[PDB]
């Protein structure tokens, strides 16, 4: 019940689509700049108490970092960022989807942090024991609001079955509460900045609709302000 260190800030997921529609006129690059600034803030304020992991989804999940302490250094991250180039603009729009990143994100949140492992080392069979609440941040170019709603459904069913699998596993944990941050980017000028609607006892969901540019970084900053928590 120690909700302090076990806040959603302790677990941060970044999912950005490297699908070629995010290279419309390097748009993903801009999203990278904003998300990298958020990741800067988290490590600087909370050197080892707020943790961040990053995922890219060019038709498949490409995870660039782990919960471990060594990965939580921005230079190590930047090497992996430079490794992924720009999405091929002539490549198949089919098969490319952020869903791989979201499913991998659920798997990453099920994974334990080193501090959570220390808590397991001390604790033993206590009620209201250590919880596993986390936050997911997705940045993408969305097509329809129904697209976003189906993504919410996918995440919910993924969490349900993944917790079913992880409950019997005693080297990974179930998720008490996830938080979902949905971010859509239109460059020129449909998603609605839909209010928070926590869809399940485990699931929490949020929707936003904002254009490109660091007003998104400021909105991120407002989120980080809630996320100092």
């Amino acid at each position: 019940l120690e909700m302090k260190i076990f806040s959603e800030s302790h677990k941060t997921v970044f999912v950005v689509d490297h699908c070629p529609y995010m290279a419309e006129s390097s748009l993903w690059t801009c999203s990278v700049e904003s998300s990298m600034e958020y990741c800067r803030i988290m490590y600087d304020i909370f050197p080892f108490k707020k943790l961040v992991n990053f995922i890219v989804s060019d038709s498949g999940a490409h995870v660039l970092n782990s919960w471990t302490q060594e990965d939580q250094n921005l230079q190590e991250l930047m090497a992996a960022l430079a490794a992924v180039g720009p999405p091929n603009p002539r490549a198949d729009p089919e098969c490319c989807s952020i869903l791989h990143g979201l499913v991998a994100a659920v798997e990453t949140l099920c994974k334990i942090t080193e501090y959570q492992h220390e808590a397991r080392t001390l604790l033993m069979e206590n009620a209201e024991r250590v919880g596993n609440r986390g936050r997911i941040i997705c940045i993408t170019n969305a097509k329809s609001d129904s697209h976003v709603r189906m993504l919410e459904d996918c995440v919910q069913e993924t969490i349900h079955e993944h917790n079913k699998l992880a409950a019997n596993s005693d080297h990974l944990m179930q998720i008490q509460k996830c938080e979902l941050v949905l971010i859509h980017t239109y460059p020129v000028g449909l998603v609605s900045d839909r209010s928070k609607k926590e869809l399940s006892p485990v699931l929490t969901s949020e929707v936003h609709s904002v254009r490109a540019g660091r007003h998104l970084a400021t909105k991120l900053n407002i989120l980080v302000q809630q996320h100092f928590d």
Binding site: S97, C154, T158
Partner: peptide, 23 residues
């Protein structure tokens, strides 16, 4: 495990469902 294949099923499932908006 026996049901991680259901994780892959979910991923694929919603991947096909995504095409309607993708197209």
């Amino acid at each position: 495990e026996d049901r991680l294949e259901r994780l892959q099923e979910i991923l694929r499932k919603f991947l096909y469902l995504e095409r309607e908006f993708r197209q």
